[PDB]
Amino acid sequence: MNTVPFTSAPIEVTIGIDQYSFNVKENQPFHGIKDIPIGHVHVIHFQHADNSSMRYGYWFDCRMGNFYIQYDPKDGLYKMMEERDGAKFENIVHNFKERQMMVSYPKIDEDDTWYNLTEFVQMDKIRKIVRKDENQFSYVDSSMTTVQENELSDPAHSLNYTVINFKSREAIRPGHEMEDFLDKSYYLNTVMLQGIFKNSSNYFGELQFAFLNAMFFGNYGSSLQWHAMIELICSSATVPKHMLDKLDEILYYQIKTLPEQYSDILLNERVWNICLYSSFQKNSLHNTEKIMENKYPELL
């Protein structure tokens, strides 16, 4: 179990860690989060009491270093930083724990929710989507736009998701215009899985990471990317059976976890009705279909 200490909390802020969140008052003696499960990626995120705009946060993995949070009064936000002095860091962590100024990552033992949302998400792939290689952690916020969005302005701040576009030469073999547009198996299995992602796990990992960015930051381009990667699979007649079963589990925990009040902006009606009811794979997402019907029948 690992720790992310906080130097201080000078401004009133809602702090999130993975799917959990806490209210912290201006200059409340708060100094970090302990008992963070090793073995998964994590995300620590923030929403200032004074600006319910711009949720922001940091993806990290404690196996890659000792990370802490410090408020920057110039830039006006809680910053993640890396401490390279291992002794000095155990020292700060132990004093704060002794003084008991840290919240515990509140994992119920039965609960596999975070594992299920992050099964395929790997820190090394995140740092290729969020390119900032002087840091081991990755910053994301509400406003960041994707590479595909930029095409249709600042590349340093882009989400480098893989561009999927159903009406592109990449997606459509010459002479198989109709075939490939109605049955995207070629685009999925040869172009995307064998070509770019190399395997199903990296694809699922980018799918899961897009979803979580859309959920935690309301990042609209991430939502677009999540729906695109679902639709590509569902619009393919020929999908490895193992990917279908895993997809049903992935989507089930994402729908389960979504805030009920946000189902209107986060769930594209067309894609979901198409995937669940029209597509080749309409019959292959039984768990996802049951949770969608019993929880958001209106959207359908």
């Binding site: 009406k167 592109s168 030469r169 459509i172 215009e177 109709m178 547009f181």
Partner: protein
């Protein structure tokens, strides 16, 4: 964007554009089988691709053989139309390729878009106009060449005959659509009007009779009257 009543005059500027109508591409008769079930029999069809500024019509004849052994023919019809329009563009010299293609039915946008991926600067547009190009097979000479075809065939026509020697594109197009609207609403009457007088003939290289200007005024008024009578009949007004 979509073509509508407001941007109607864009059709007659000097940017090359084509209308594409697919309504007559997949044509069937419906009949009863010996066991009493219903079956379809395909007949020859055509893609109607028209330059509204010049009158040049590219009538691509769709021979029934293209359906042999195919499923979901009405959906395939859209993709075959797009394939053939794309091949037309590819066959044309660069300076004759259109800048826009306007499809008369929205279901053609995705097939054409996908078939035109090699031409990213050609804009594919829908329209909100209710154009009467399905009545093209009411023009005797076009119906004849379609039905007699024994293989895929492209036939070129000027749908305006020689009108442009004397009137503008705008006026030519309004006359064409008035004639076709009439033919669509009441084919028998419309054709009676056009042919009543045996002393006004159709030139061998033309589609419509060689009316003088005054006679076109009388014709057009008769087509208008036809169209409004049929309206009152349809709606009890």
């Amino acid at each position: 964007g979509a073509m509508n009543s407001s941007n109607y005059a864009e059709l007659f500027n000097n940017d090359i554009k084509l209308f594409v109508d697919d309504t007559n591409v997949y044509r069937v008769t419906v009949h009863k089988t010996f066991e009493g079930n219903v079956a379809t029999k395909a007949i020859n069809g055509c893609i109607f691709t028209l330059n509204p500024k010049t009158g040049h019509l590219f009538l691509k004849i769709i021979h029934t053989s293209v359906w042999a052994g195919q499923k979901r023919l009405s959906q395939l019809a859209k993709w075959k139309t797009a394939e053939e329009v794309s091949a037309l563009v590819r066959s044309l010299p660069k300076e004759e390729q259109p800048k826009q293609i306007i499809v008369t039915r929205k279901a053609m946008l995705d097939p054409l878009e996908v078939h035109m991926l090699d031409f990213p600067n050609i804009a594919i547009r829908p329209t909100e106009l209710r154009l009467p190009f399905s009545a093209a097979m009411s023009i005797d000479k076009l119906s004849d060449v379609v039905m007699k075809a024994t293989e895929p065939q492209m036939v070129l026509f000027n749908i305006y005959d020689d009108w442009l020697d004397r009137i503008s594109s705008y006026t030519a197009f309004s006359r064409l659509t008035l004639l076709l609207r009439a033919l669509k609403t009441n084919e028998e009457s419309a054709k009676m009007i056009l042919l009543s007088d045996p002393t006004i003939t159709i030139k061998s290289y033309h589609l419509w009779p060689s009316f003088t200007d005054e006679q076109w005024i009388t014709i057009e008024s008769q087509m208008r009257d036809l169209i409004l009578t049929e309206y009152g009949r349809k709606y009890n007004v």
